[PDB]
């Protein structure tokens, strides 16, 4: 050193690091990118809970984003931004175990409220370097602390044999946890406060925030939390120990390896690609929105199903912000269910529309099934394609997020928590997915994150002062629990969601208007009607 | 004597009355009999023709009721005191009514018939609210009614006995429809153009009359009032007849040996039958009726589910339709927390609990899915909504959702449908508001006594009874309640299974709607019965 920016110098617990001064709309911001957090999960370390990364002796450079976890890489749409935009973004490696921190420049000199961003993907996807989870705006225009990990996902992050010491389950949550243990030891360096650190995170990220909350071990880790469009409970989020075996040593089969021990050792042997070569034949039905390896309740992590841990659970001291976009399932329809492409309208038939339903709602039987599809048939135009098109993507949305997360908010405001919610209704002007699938998973990042402040990425005016308005709510709720502005009254404010009332926000270009009921009846409809006619049948 | 009030019919000569309504006389024929006495050996049996008769049959008055109990839940209350038996209790019965215009007729004229319900235990042709003055004098119509037995009396059945072999007050009424086309000429009506018209039990029975082909042709034209051959009270299997009259049997303690058991329950003095007529249901129960129509393989061939589904039904007309509340009168009869004298503010305990007795045939988990349906999830426990909720469960399933059904199965099936919901609130109305427009109070704006000054409605709704008075009678003129001069009211569109029109009857004019409660009978026709058959 001598020669080098003395503002991007800092030292940590493995030892020194050197970062990069990048520029945002407003004035620069610091980054630290690729910082390591563990031991590479390497040969006899996969499958095997993290250790935590032994010092290091000089200079470690952080300037640049490390490897992507190891992972199936999408081929439905090849060329398509729609689809792309979520593919690695790095070279695709086992040794992938590193974390990103973004800061005001120069380093804030009093304490600062810190945002963790863990990424959605299905648990067998993502990386914390694609642009969409660019911390540099939050940082620049919010003053924020944001950190964010990558973690291990499909079989190298959740394939169990549940009961063995070599292959535990749940290590990519571990790894999550070891990166959560690190900001606690080390984000003061850096000018964050860790007596404030709030998790946020979207579909499988959410899920994964929602089991920190569930897991006793995590919740010294944080103090508030952000669910975006994905819960732990819900009939994808998690698998039984039993059905986590059965796919561990169906693969198992699939890739040569015929004892615990035995099977996982030469699972070890297996290169990596092998692996995501067969992790989607060991589904147990032809599905859309389910996911062949995802936390499992061993007993450990989850001390019980993430429905019992909701329904007991004491959650007086807990601040969460919950929320869903307008068009959950639209997204998953084209990746499955014969009709539906990204090219035409997908009109579809009452036929392509019962068969539709068994694979969007794979676990029902026969008499479930005809329930789903006589409550979301329009009886006035029972064969309107437009509606059947439309019901089916409600279908996927309401089964898997949208009910999931109705119930969620219930549980943890009837048990003590504050709870605020939200319905995400814009659609981005510059979104290459066609009209018919409204707002779809995944696409109010882009805003929270504040991507439209870029000039260069092409949004309106109105979408970056939209923007600006969202940052603005979930660092505010970051800061202090309440998203709305303590200083700003008259325009709108943001009520607690209650059992009683049932309050929830549109966020959308228009200024916040109060909704009642998140889908209320349709959602007793999943929640309460279709488990009874299974505990039955 | 006045010549227009006599009239020579095929069993002998009548002498009528002139009786008065607003606008100027009218011709009544009353007490007419159209069958022998139902009484001693005849008891449980078929209905024999009235042997001729001497002289001159005295016409002037209304004739006994039949046998029948006697309600008792608020005595002295006009709002159920207006339904029970206003002659002498008889089994001796069956007698039959004609209003037609005075002078009579100079040609032949549309005849309307009229069929009351009471849930086949109960009813008469001579209530204030059937008076058939209206419709004769203003719209120049010959109107008919009958008596027909009801409770035991008329449906007593031992399926496959000679002796009691079920749904003999159908038999009455059919033999009424049948003295119709001999007789009704002589009055100036025309037997070729004959519309029925019934409401409640009394709509179940024009249903039987269109699914029974002995009777299809003794009439032309349907009118179905809150009510429908099809759904859970109207009939019972062979099966469950048998079981109820052997029950009430044992009751009274006859007697094995179906001649045996039915010749004791001959001896009985006809109060004794009734006394024991609500101990033989399965189940604690509204909208249930002890004896009604059975399937027998005879006059119904197979159940109304089956014949609706696989008939022929091109060549007809139908005119069919609801109140806006069909639920609510039955809930003081029987649902812990609803009475007619306060504002009837339920728990939701007691909502689960008035859901097991409003559909008593419902599996516990059948309940469960009736509960969740009708639960508003935005406000799960308010009293009120709870109330409206449970009168809903009632009306939607035993008669809305059994409407809408044969409204679907008819039109498909080449029939001409016309459909309604009739949504104005009497205001001389006695039971509370609560109730809103219960079932039974259309009847009385149909037959026009709102016309009637000294009854104190109000000028709205006198010009309202003008107007059903008119659909009716034009639906009985040619099939299509539209009024064939008028230019426009709107104009009332047929029910079609793709489109669903329907349109609500109020003083306001005619609007189309489309869909009756089409979600909510999704429930009802399409999935509960999926949930039986797996379980
Ligand atoms: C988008 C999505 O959920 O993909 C799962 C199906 N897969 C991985 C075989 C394409
Ligand atoms: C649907 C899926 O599996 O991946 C798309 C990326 N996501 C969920 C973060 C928007
Ligand atoms: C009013 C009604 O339909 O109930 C009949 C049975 N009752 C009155 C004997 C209890
Ligand atoms: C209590 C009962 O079932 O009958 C009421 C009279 N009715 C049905 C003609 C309106």
Redesign the pocket.
């Given at each position: 050193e001598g020669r080098e920016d003395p503002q991007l110098l800092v030292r940590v617990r493995g030892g020194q690091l050197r970062g990069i001064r990048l520029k945002a709309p407003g004035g620069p911001v610091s980054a630290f990118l690729g910082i390591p957090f563990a031991e590479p999960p390497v040969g006899s370390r996969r499958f095997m809970p993290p250790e935590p990364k032994r010092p290091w002796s000089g200079v470690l450079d952080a300037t640049t984003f490390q490897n992507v976890c190891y992972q199936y890489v999408d081929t439905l749409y090849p060329g398509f931004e729609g689809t792309e935009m979520?593919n690695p973004n790095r070279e695709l490696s086992e040794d992938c175990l590193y974390l990103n921190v973004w800061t005001p420049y120069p380093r804030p000199a009093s304490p600062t409220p810190v945002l963790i961003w863990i990424?959605?993907?299905?648990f067998y996807?993502?990386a914390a370097s694609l642009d969409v989870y660019d911390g540099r705006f939050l940082a620049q225009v919010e003053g924020a602390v944001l950190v964010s990990m990558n973690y291990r996902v499909g079989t190298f992050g959740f394939l169990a044999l549940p009961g063995s010491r070599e292959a535990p389950g749940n290590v990519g949550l571990l790894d999550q946890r070891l990166a959560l243990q690190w900001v606690q030891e080390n984000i003061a360096a850096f000018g964050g406060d860790p007596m404030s650190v709030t998790l946020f995170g979207?579909?499988a990220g959410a899920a994964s925030v929602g089991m920190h909350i569930l897991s006793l071990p995590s919740r010294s880790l944080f103090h508030r939390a952000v669910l975006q469009s994905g819960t732990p409970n819900g009939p994808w989020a998690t698998v039984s120990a039993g059905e986590a075996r059965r796919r561990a040593t169906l693969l198992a089969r699939l890739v040569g390896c015929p004892n615990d021990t035995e099977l996982i050792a030469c699972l070890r042997t297996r290169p990596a690609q092998d692996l995501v070569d067969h992790e989607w034949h060991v589904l147990p039905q032809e599905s859309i929105f389910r996911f062949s390896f995802v936390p499992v309740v061993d007993g450990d992590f989850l001390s019980d199903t993430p429905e019992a841990l909701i329904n007991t659970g004491d959650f007086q001291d807990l601040q969460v912000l919950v929320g869903v976009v307008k068009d959950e399932g639209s997204?998953?329809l084209v990746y499955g269910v014969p009709g539906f492409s990204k090219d035409n309208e997908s009109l579809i038939s009452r036929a392509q529309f019962l068969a539709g339903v068994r694979i969007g709602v794979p676990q029902a039987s026969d008499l479930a099934a005809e329930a789903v599809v006589l409550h979301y048939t329009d009886w006035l135009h029972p064969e309107d394609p437009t509606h059947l098109r439309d019901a089916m993507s409600a279908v996927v949305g309401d089964h898997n997020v949208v009910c999931p997360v109705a119930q969620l908010a219930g549980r943890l405001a009837a048990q003590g928590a504050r709870v605020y919610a939200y319905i995400f209704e814009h659609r981005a002007s510059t979104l290459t997915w066609p009209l018919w699938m409204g707002v779809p998973?995944?696409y109010e990042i882009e805003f929270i994150f504040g991507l439209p402040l870029d000039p260069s990425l092409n949004y309106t005016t109105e979408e970056r002062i939209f923007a600006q308005r969202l940052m603005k709510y979930w660092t505010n709720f970051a800061r202090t629990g309440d998203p709305n502005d303590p200083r700003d009254s008259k325009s709108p404010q943001w009520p607690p969601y209650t059992t009683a009332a049932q309050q929830y926000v549109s966020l959308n270009l228009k200024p916040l208007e109060v909704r009642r009921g998140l889908r209320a009846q349709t959602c007793a409809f999943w929640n309460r009607f279709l488990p009874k006619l299974l505990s039955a049948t």
């Open positions: 979520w990424y959605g993907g299905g996807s993502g979207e579909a997204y998953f998973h995944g």
